[PDB]
């Protein structure tokens, strides 16, 4: 694509600069270019990809929610609906781009648990974002695609990673959100968050001070959700 002529290392360097400049659209385009070079991504690189697109789609989702709220209160000419649709289509396109990178070919080359879980979690998240705005004939299939990705990620994480691993924890946090917000399964959400929290607590004794800080941060986010849901 447009980044085809730039060195991989230059793309990663520019992604880091774009992060510092809070230029997340540029950051995402740089990381897309890096992925399209065809090499596997390191841990640091995977996190740059994730930060870039989470910020892009996060803005789009926030805008969509504002507009959807206005549209629902209006139910006046076609403008609110048209503009909500425009933002929706742009959001769908970003989700499709990320899903495209994971399918071509990040997931299939990811053999280590840390990489494969990370990418399947991302796959679940971006189908979840598609689900948030879906209404048509494919909505159930979209939800099932998110569910399937999260479930594969969970199965690997349980086999291959300790209960305190931040990826394992963040995956459980977001799958529990999927259950509560998308799948109409609050009990499943609560169970998953509480079992994840408890199993992590029991493994904290194995951790260094730095690892402890990472794990307990995510555990507190699980607890915050449990407090909100109960």
């Amino acid at each position: 694509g447009a980044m085809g002529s730039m060195e991989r290392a230059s793309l990663i360097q520019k992604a880091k600069l774009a992060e510092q400049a809070e230029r997340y659209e540029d950051m995402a385009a740089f990381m897309k270019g890096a992925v399209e070079k065809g090499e596997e991504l390191s841990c640091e690189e995977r996190n740059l990809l994730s930060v870039a697109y989470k910020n892009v789609v996060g803005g789009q989702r926030a805008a969509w929610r504002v507009l959807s709220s206005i549209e629902q209160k209006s139910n006046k000419g076609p403008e609110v609906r048209e503009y909500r649709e425009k933002v929706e289509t742009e959001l769908q396109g970003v989700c499709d781009t990320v899903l495209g990178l994971l399918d071509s070919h990040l997931i299939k080359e990811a053999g280590d648990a840390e990489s494969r879980v990370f990418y399947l979690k991302m796959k679940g998240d971006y189908y979840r974002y598609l689900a948030e705005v879906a209404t048509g004939d494919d909505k159930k299939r979209i939800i099932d695609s998110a569910r399937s990705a999260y479930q594969e990620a969970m199965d690997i994480s349980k086999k291959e990673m300790p209960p305190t691993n931040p990826i394992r924890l963040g995956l459980a946090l977001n799958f529990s959100v999927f259950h509560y917000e998308i799948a109409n399964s609050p009990e499943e959400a609560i169970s998953l968050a509480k079992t994840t929290f408890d199993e992590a607590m029991a493994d904290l004794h194995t951790l260094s001070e730095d690892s402890y800080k990472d794990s307990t941060l995510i555990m507190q986010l699980l607890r915050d959700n449990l407090t909100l849901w109960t």
Partner: peptide, 7 residues
């Protein structure tokens, strides 16, 4: 909406 993992 409930909070997911932040960045």
């Amino acid at each position: 909406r409930t909070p997911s993992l932040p960045t």
